[model samples]
Target chain A: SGFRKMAFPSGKVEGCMVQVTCGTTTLNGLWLDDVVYCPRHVICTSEDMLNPNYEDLLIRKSNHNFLVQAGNVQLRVIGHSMQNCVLKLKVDTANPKTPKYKFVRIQPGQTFSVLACYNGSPSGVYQCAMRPNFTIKGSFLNGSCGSVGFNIDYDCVSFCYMHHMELPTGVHAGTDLEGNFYGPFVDRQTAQAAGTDTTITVNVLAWLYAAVINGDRWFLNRFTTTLNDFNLVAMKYNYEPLTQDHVDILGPLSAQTGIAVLDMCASLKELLQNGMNGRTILGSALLEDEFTPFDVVRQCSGVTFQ
Target chain B: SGFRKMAFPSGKVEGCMVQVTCGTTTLNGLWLDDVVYCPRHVICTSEDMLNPNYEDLLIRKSNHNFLVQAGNVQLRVIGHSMQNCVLKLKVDTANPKTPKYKFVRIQPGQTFSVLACYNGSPSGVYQCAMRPNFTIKGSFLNGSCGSVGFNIDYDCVSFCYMHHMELPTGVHAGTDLEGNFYGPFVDRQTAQAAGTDTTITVNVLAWLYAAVINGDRWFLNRFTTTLNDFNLVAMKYNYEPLTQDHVDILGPLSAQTGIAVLDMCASLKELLQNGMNGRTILGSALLEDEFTPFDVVRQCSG
Candidate 1:
């Protein structure tokens, strides 16, 4: 699909909403998404990296979707806006409009760098903001831009955990790595509402995985109901329903770990097939994660598509 | 000073209020507080470790105070409630009245264990809750009996960070590592009003330390203004004002970190001197921490 004709399915991708459908392969072969499936690495190099947003990068490492190492890495962003828009990158800036970039005017389907990282483990705080009609995508926040799409999404933890889950409320704005103010973000309740169905789906699965690891049956039960809601939604779409096979995947889980896992994978599979442009599965890890244990076993047994 | 007569002066002592005028050792060398330095080690163990409250013990490792290897360690609470009351300890229960304990009576100013640890890594969730007219002071959450006090106090993180700072406004009940519910807790704005002047002192200092370490000159400036308010309070008591020495102690810190250290110590000093039934310092580290850098530097230079 060309840049302009592409459209994101009605759900969250990565952490952010699918604002545009413009998917492209850079001359180097790096795939890019407008707002979703971008930013390979998010990191904090400050002395006191205690902020909640600083935590999202940490959570996504185990999210079962995207994974990359952060901390003390040289990084960069590559973008191509379909519109004649200006993109600004800043180390620490209060105002996005006036905070100048190192370089720009990245016209339709063009790639531009804010600054070339000649070398060194340079650290501190850095952020990329797009002007109206302009956007970019990348795998990591700071790194060498190989011609490979990282499928790294932006702001998932804040957009997913604090926003979508509505637990741990009242997250006031904490400083970025350089002690610059980012946001109070949204409160717990409002964030969940703004989170699109896709982002919500990933986060629910992520949290359920955490609950299972921690052996929190309380939250396991809590998310069981969450998966059931998604199951109902999937059923409405006439998606393949999870049965004994799906239930069997959640090994040794009582109550709903098994159920939540069965439905989570099934629902994501249906939603992904419906959209996600071109065969862009973000990365191989997501594809690996999408299959349930039972499905894998069944395939091995030659019971289903191998 | 006896257990009944000893009292706490005022100000923060290990993150809680100095509750009484009497601060002394019972039979053990422990110094107790009303709501501050308790719990030597709060930890968790599991068949597979599935409870939510178990998470709190883990959370504390990063909570900035009292860090010890948790996952494994013996713990116990030694209590002396100066009242004719009963203390009940139990594992995960809704009925506070109905939950059974291994022991009871626990007379005023005396220590009692729920039961002896028969020794096999006793794994399960356990908590001690007191009904009306009964309370406790402990050196740790669980273990053997000693004659002295533990300098124990009650909850501080919610009361200190959330309540005093007013960042997280509405802190409803959050589950623990074991999934047991604990506290809507006080908010930052209101908690200060509820705390003793002493508690307010410690919390403010604690906030200042966090901001300084985070290099938040914004909050440091914010808290400098707060310290000024407390500075005015210290001046009222003529509490040996922070001199040029205090300024020098801050080294690279701006006014508040230094002033906060000064006033935190001055306020705590007055509070400690005024009461502390007998000459008791919970552990020497607290005594060492109580002093300003100026004092430490001054003594070192001499």
Candidate 2:
């Protein structure tokens, strides 16, 4: 229970943010401790606030050898989902002296991705606000507390593999009691061969339960639920399907399984095709007629291109 | 009640297959039977099926005098949101049908979009799928669907001045029920000014919603709920809140408010953030223990 009396003069960070010896890690001194992440992460226990220029913040390509190794430190965005923009580390160099636009882009209603890089050189704090317009929302970066020691964080994701491995240290997210999720880690890499016998390996994750805050709900795993069910509905119609990225890379494999999935889609389409296919099925079937896509997409813009 | 035996006999079409009106529209054998129209919608009713030839789909500047009479239809997407890819309709001889590779490039876990354009000429349907490499999932005829509804459809749309006009023959989704959705509409005088204002709008929509169905849900919409109050908590830190599209356009916004939203997101970022606020604030002081963000940002987004 021993603790040191902490004080700040100019609200500037000047202490450690994370630590890593073997496995168990800790984050110690974050300022704007958000309730969403505050329960899990403790920040500012790794590096002091150094007067760094934008160029000084970049991770050298050479630093990454076999795995990512954080040279300086890492950032951690405390957002739920980053479906549109990735949590990127941007520095406003216009005025290094507390740039007026320290992070001025975030506006109301805009898709503002909070600054939480949590890895690599030139990394510290980042904040992105929301913009009203976005198309294909991306995944939010988690691991709010961990050190980029010496390995790439690899997991069976749902959509595709989102690699944040930059710099000299490889950072992995600590064990989450709450849960971490992403989608379809589809890949067309020549696991067996590179050019001649290129075998694209696409492993779509079905929603498998991991862990929520208190108890595990029926759906805790992102890979199983969204990719297997909802994303399937989006792609079948081809109107605004979830991730073509996954299909583009692994659809050939998906073609083999069409017997089971498309059969269901065809049956569903058949059930709702009487002047009720396309947008209608989406509303009636996917949302159980509770949501009106025809009216909604129209509201979102089918008639007026403003 | 009237119904006729209508079928594409595989040889009825010779020229471009333009607008084929469905729903309960009139069709007297003397004029508007099952037909594919030309630029002026010159009635070309045929009872056979012939694969429509692309060349006949061309609309000459002469036949399309309405282009001069009222000018062409113009639209520009405004505001901000994200989608799978882009669907642009433009009739330009400059556009190509080579099927450029760059047209589709989605990151492994990262989402991407497309910008489709339709020149006057007919094109093949594309099958653009994504898994390993970029390939054609699917393609549609350039003139397929109502994208090429000849001159009369445009004329019909303009009959009403939008703000005060009566809807024409066909009715597609127009913004949300609130009428706030912005598409590709632009004022002739300040087209460029309006374009910059909507850069974020299109990009957001391209990556957040249209590109991936239900993908946006994982980010904010359906991920949480409150305890005693039943509210969503993730909206406070949502990367991008819903725009006219989700709310006004495609909405049936979920209910995952209060501490529930936090719990859902906590389940997510925990692997990354390592449990920040101490699971289920038992006896604390700050926010979650005090009040819910459900009413503030409007309950549930985790």
Candidate 3:
């Protein structure tokens, strides 16, 4: 069990933080010494900070590929060296004399995903420095690892793909977990199409659910046990019933289904009739109701906008 | 009880719904019947369909003055003849044989707003015919009231002032209560300003509550209790800590404070930095989190 430490005099280490590589597959450093990996996850290893062991290790110069490949909410590390090294991260960029963040023990050899480090909403232009250190047969040898700097920005595409690959993005710019922002990704045509389509789909569904299946409490309460903006969306859109029959059914289902349909109909009607700018539709909807994070989960299935 | 009835087989009445007058003060009828208005609202009355009475009622020659004065969502009726009148509103002209809508009872003298008739959101040009039916000493006299025609066009301003007064109108034309549309009311500048001003208020409040007050459940839960957005417009518009103590306090209070400050700062920075349109700021905020309606309630208390 041996270890090595690198100094971050500027309180922040810029560039590639740490790279643990064995062959081509790099290993991710665990946030905790014993944070268990899920069953679905195959690669899992243990690291000892007080005592580290790495005998057959190789070292090479650090490249900016992994740092470059890193995203707004995630960072990836590539490596050619396989050895146990001390690692540290800090939010203290005020003084350049001492580092003020957390540290861990990591080995090089496998490509590591440091997403766990960012799971807690990391901030600022973070950088990483690799110490040229290795542990062989319970003996520590000083070595160096490279560091890289990255900043989170208003990258809608990256966040959309990461946070909710299926949908999680909105029709506007909003903050990331780290208080950064992810902007809108849809074009006007796409927004109009989505507003209309979503409205129609919900309208048809509401009509069906209310007419065939009883507009009972069970169906509504059960159908949306998981978080959904069914009612809120409905009301925002203009999903009013044109015919009296549509009205008759709504009278009974007015609790959740009817109201949502009405709101959604209004919203949809605005979008459909005026082809309102996507931002306007979205902004207006915001005024009508309080939206939760869950409401913005991007569930757009194969939707396209130029 | 005296009553009057008139028919517009043409399926369109292009005049007025009702007119109420006494001496010099005359009140016009709006589209709402029994919409319960405020004292600020001068004309509010009840309408009975069967027997109407306006014997001592003041009568004056019909003038289009009130008609011209009317705005979207509401119209005023000036009348001399008073009696029981059957009112009809249709989304028609395209079709008149059938009523194609619902029926309601209205009386004269007291201003009757026909808002309920529109609760279902009616569209298209509509006219109303007033019938004079008086129940005096149990006597019913059938008479006739005038009719008026009005179109719900893209009158966004009328609706905005009428609906929310705070934010009653939208920009385009769409359906009313019966799926009829009322239109947009402002130049681009106003809408953009409202959006930006509204966004900043919420950001600041959220920051203050979430940061200096402790983001814990109790303080947050209690602070938000009783509906208050905390008047910290000073900070939002531009109030900063001055002393080391102020800074020191915020340093500790900044766990939540810092993030929100950063967020709001970035937002204001962009706004100040770029003077970007309010719509852009609003659009971006949508991506952040779900905002409650109250958060964006457009209240800039002084």
Candidate 4:
């Protein structure tokens, strides 16, 4: 779609809505939306690094919706906005030396979606920097451009943990790197909302998946109302961490290893999910994180600040 | 006044909104507005801390308002908001603790103030801990009571900053303290509209009077329309230090000692009237800060 005719969707993209779609390639082959993608700033010289809106060269979709503040967390989005947008756990472009983490060309007034990265990496400052396709007016006279958007402790931790499950050890789950560490994202309240008293059992079964004991299709026995020892065969692969610190500053069951995960978990998780056993899942890790891989997140915006 | 009745003049109280107000106690005492100055939570023991709205007991009005977000900073209130709140910045306090920040007793459907004292302190954050009475409320059972009044990054910084000056400082302000303390707070155009420009400047002037310049009437003149003049004065009295990284962050402005004297000079230049000479007005050695008299802030949630 052309720039003027293109109207990005708003809110969650459900039912029908007007949308102007673009792919990863058309927008410089980089992902956009909720993720704080990378810098769009290209260095002209060591002395001259122009920091575009976020950066001049980086392109992405955006939201036209202004922020609507609730008590603790603020939430808002225009309809159909996230359809063609890419969501990254983060997209940092703030670099004085290398022009890093900046995105330059975010098309103006287009709506997109991204979960708040509640980790508080950049000191939990809730603000969004947008580089628009269109030029903005009025900065303090010397020549500044459009306004930036941000959140203050947006409870991104809550957003990040939404669909993931917490399967303790001895539970079976889908794994990567040859069956080491298997897990899935499951709905805690929704399962009950969907009606079933065997939830914890079904959840435990899917989480503790094992091919030797069960078959490929595990859902059949997992949702079973009654068991004849047949349901035990199906397992639910749960890799949910016992610590709720990452979920919502809820709790850190252990203080020793706060929330840092194994260094190689992201790449291994990515490598294992190349084919993907599950598709069209809500809160899919694939959909949940597209920018910083889970493995490398802690290194980037997880627990430290530079 | 009752909790539901309007009290505390609308938009009148601020930390630094001085000159018009006589002193620190007078400045800090401006509480509630448009709504009643009603307090909600009671001084309950740990035994009764689990009532439906008991979560209000754990929020602290204990920061200078610029408490950083996300990254962690820890501190103690040394006073009491139901016995001295121990704030954990950017973290959750769904549960209260002893010697920790706890028990703000705002009544149901009312409102009060909050200051998360996790700002690494001995300053603004703790003074707030001593705010004996303001206003408060208790409601919203589903995860509502714990949030600070404004977003630290978004609104609090600008709003709190507005306390020092009568007019709003354009988003371009010099760090009033030492080190790499630049702010994204002053850079915003919205401070005026947010009423933060007024609110922050007023409070700041008061805070400085109460904290640094020792309520010396002359020091109040340091806040001016000229940025350079303000910086010059701020340098003289800014007792905080600038580390290597701080100099790097703030450029060359923070690379010297004796700057505090320069601030005193500027204020002395400006405040030579009404028999409010700097030395008598300040009433203590400029070199020594802790002994100088300033304002009063409470340590309880009275």
TM-score for all models, in order of appearance: 0.20, 0.19, 0.19, 0.20
lDDT of 2 by residue, A1-306 (tens): 000000001101112122211113222212212211111212112241122222232222121111212233333322221112121212111111121111122111221111122422112121111111211112223342331111001111011112221111111112111222112211111121111111011111110000111122222212222335544553444323324453343233234322222333333333322422323221111212111212122111222210
Question: What stretches of model 4 exceed 4 Å from their correct place?
Answer: A1-39, A42-44, A47-120, A124-306, B1-257, B261-302
Candidate 4, residues B68-153: lDDT per residue as tens digits?
Answer: 22124222222222211211222222112111112232211122222211111100010111111111111111111121221122
Regions more than 4 Å wrong, model 2: A1-138, A142-306, B1-53, B56-302
Candidate 4 scores a chain A TM-score of: 0.17
lDDT of 1 by residue, B152-175 (tens): 122111111000111121111111
C-alpha lDDT (0 to 100) for residue B239 of candidate 2: 24
Candidate lDDT scores, in order, read: 0.23, 0.20, 0.22, 0.20
DockQ of each: 0.01, 0.01, 0.01, 0.01
lDDT of 2 by residue, B1-302 (tens): 00001111100111222222212111110001221111211111232113322124222212222111001322121211112111112222221211111111221111111111122211111111111111111112122222211101111211000010001111111111112222332211122211211012112222222212222232333433233222122233332233333332222221322223333333333312332232211111111210111111211123
Q: Point to the candidate with the largest TM-score.
A: 4
Instruction: Give the higher-TM-score candidate: 1 or 3.
Output: 1
Q: Give stretches of model 3 more than 4 Å off.
A: A1-39, A42-252, A255-267, A271-306, B1-302
- Docking quality level of the chain pair in candidate 2: incorrect
Number of the top candidate by lDDT? 1
lDDT of 1 by residue, A171-237 (tens): 1211121222123332122331211112223222433343333333332222222446555665564
Which consecutive 10 residues in model 1 chain A have the weakest lDDT in total?
A: A1-10
